Amino acid sequence: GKSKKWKEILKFPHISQCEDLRRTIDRDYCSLCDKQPIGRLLFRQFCETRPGLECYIQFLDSVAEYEVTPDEKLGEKGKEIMTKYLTPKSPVFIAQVGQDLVSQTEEKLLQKPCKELFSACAQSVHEYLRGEPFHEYLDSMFFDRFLQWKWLERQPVTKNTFRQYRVLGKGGFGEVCACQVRATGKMYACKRLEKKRIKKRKGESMALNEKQILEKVNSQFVVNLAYAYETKDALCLVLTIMNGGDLKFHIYNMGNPGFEEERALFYAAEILCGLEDLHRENTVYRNLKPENILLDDYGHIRISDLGLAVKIPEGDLIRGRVGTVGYMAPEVLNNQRYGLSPDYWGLGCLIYEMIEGQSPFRGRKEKVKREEVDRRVLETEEVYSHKFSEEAKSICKMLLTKDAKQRLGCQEEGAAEVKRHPFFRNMNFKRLEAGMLDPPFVPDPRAVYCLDHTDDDFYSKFSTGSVSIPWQNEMIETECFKELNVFGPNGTLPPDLNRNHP
């Protein structure tokens, strides 16, 4: 499904083109060998050539598997690792684990096996690879190949890069097309913004804020930005495509008015992770409502409309009285200063509404003016039913606490205080973040879930081009990496990596 000359569009440059890169990129280990998905793969490929480092990569792989193993099938697994990488004469015996380290873990095996038994060991591993092996890789042909991939990443993105298909979505100050990259065939959703209405609205700032926040965050539960290009009378965002309808549709149109508690638990957990990934950047969402929680092809969720989000300066507060009637926290209605707390109020509204099939302050079959809806948020105490377990009631009224200081999650602990709540007592967040828990509803793929110069400066800061992490993932998903990342026969330098003949 790619272009037919895509092997020439993504053709590697000659290594000689990458001297300007090599000179400026920071040689940070956690970036070049872990965060950057293609840098990670290339560094692991480096360790596979040397017999001495091969055993270290395989040990970390086994630990990654151990953090998600079920509790009952856990110690079983712990012994297998103990008797493979850390025995006296093991075939893959790793040395930088001091005899003291192994003795503390082999005795830790006897007690209640923990999911982070090997956390101590794993850090000693990275410590070793951070130094000696990493500096080898920096002077190895694989880093030269990594530099190539960067060169491609930075190539300019235009209208020709993409391929407009259809209007799959609409509304706001623009549309939502379903665009595709001609080169790799990966599908996206383009948030085309009109280039004139932004000028009259003088909202250039919020347009750049949304793009900056999307670029910064890279969560599994929030829509990711991969490209930001300007075009002829439009500035575009290329976001994660979501072909599974919104959560509002599945509460009322599909299924009974509402879900079972176990089904609402799954969505609430994923949404709580999305909010956590945003709060790490002291960024508040302020727009939690069912029609903004979207579902993908597999049954997982992502938060969608960040147009009302802002990045709070650490230690300071904000004042905006924005949002949607019925989903505004009381401190927002009162036009007070707040932090991240509105998002936890919003979470409570979603958990309540998924279980009870209606808003906690508005009856699904009740006609009330907006003023009375607000007063209920500030005064009245919501009521529950037999649909809620004791744990379900608890967390709801805790997240729906009027006083934003006693509200669950609005403390110094953060999202951790919510994951601890007995309502998630049966939720293994560690396996959820790894995508090992089966979503409860799998959408069918055939379904249909229905002129100045002061601006020239603003334009340049916006159209920054491709985003590093999402771009590299695309190259891996589309198998363009597996196909182009070819070297020489019998461990020899390819033509594009030897400097003796350009």
Ligand X SMILES: CO[C@H](C)CNC(=O)c1c(C)[nH]c(/C=C2\C(=O)N=C3CC=C(C(=O)N[C@H](C)c4ccccc4)C=C32)c1C
Site for ligand X, rule CB under 6 A: 168-169, 171-174, 176, 189, 191, 223, 239, 241-243, 294, 304-305, 307, 448-450
Q: How far is the CB of 160 from ligand X (least distance, A)?
A: 23
Q: Using an 8 Å Cβ cutoff, are 153 and 137 in contact?
A: no
Nearest of 303, 236, 147, 307 to residue 466 by alpha carbon: 236
Spatial separation of the C-alpha atoms in residues 134 and 19, rounded to whole Å: 20
Q: Using an 8 Å Cβ cutoff, are 242 and 223 in contact?
A: yes
Cβ-based nearer residue to ligand X, 43 or 462: 462
Two tokens, residue 489: 């026969």
Two tokens, residue 153: 């990443």
Q: How far is the CB of 292 from ligand X (least distance, A)?
A: 7
Cβ-based nearer residue to ligand X, 207 or 269: 207
* Cα 145–Cα 150–Cα 156 angle in degrees, nearest 5: 140
Cβ-based nearer residue to ligand X, 191 or 279: 191
Cβ-based nearer residue to ligand X, 104 or 253: 253
Phi, psi of 303 (to 5 degrees): -75, 140
75-85 vs 51-66: helix crossing angle, rounded to 10: 170
The separation between CA 101 and the C-alpha centre of its own chain, rounded to angstroms, equals: 34
Q: How far is the CB of 177 from ligand X (least distance, A)?
A: 10
Q: How far is the CB of 2 from ligand X (least distance, A)?
A: 22
Q: How far is the CB of 343 from ligand X (least distance, A)?
A: 17
Q: Is residue 258 exposed (0-12), middle (13-18) or buried (19+ Cβ within 10 Å)?
A: buried
Q: How far is the CB of 172 from ligand X (least distance, A)?
A: 2
Cβ-based nearer residue to ligand X, 152 or 207: 207
Q: How far is the CB of 7 from ligand X (least distance, A)?
A: 30
CA torsion sign for 453, 458, 463, 464 is positive
Q: What is the DSSP string of 163-198?
A: EEEEEEEE-SSBEEEEEEETTT--B-EE--EETTHH
Spatial separation of the C-alpha atoms in residues 387 and 203, rounded to whole Å: 44
CA torsion sign for 272, 278, 282, 288 is negative
Q: How far is the CB of 286 from ligand X (least distance, A)?
A: 14
Residue given tokens 């007070």 in the structure block: 336
Cβ-based nearer residue to ligand X, 253 or 336: 253
Cβ-based nearer residue to ligand X, 174 or 330: 174
Cβ-based nearer residue to ligand X, 223 or 293: 223
Q: Is 41 left (phi over 0), alpha (psi -120 to 50) or beta?
A: alpha
Residue nearest to ligand X (CB): 172
Q: How far is the CB of 306 from ligand X (least distance, A)?
A: 7
**Position 229, amino acid:** Y
Q: How far is the CB of 173 from ligand X (least distance, A)?
A: 6
Cβ-based nearer residue to ligand X, 277 or 331: 277
Cβ-based nearer residue to ligand X, 190 or 264: 190
Phi, psi of 237 (to 5 degrees): -115, 140
Spatial separation of the C-alpha atoms in residues 461 and 18, rounded to whole Å: 25
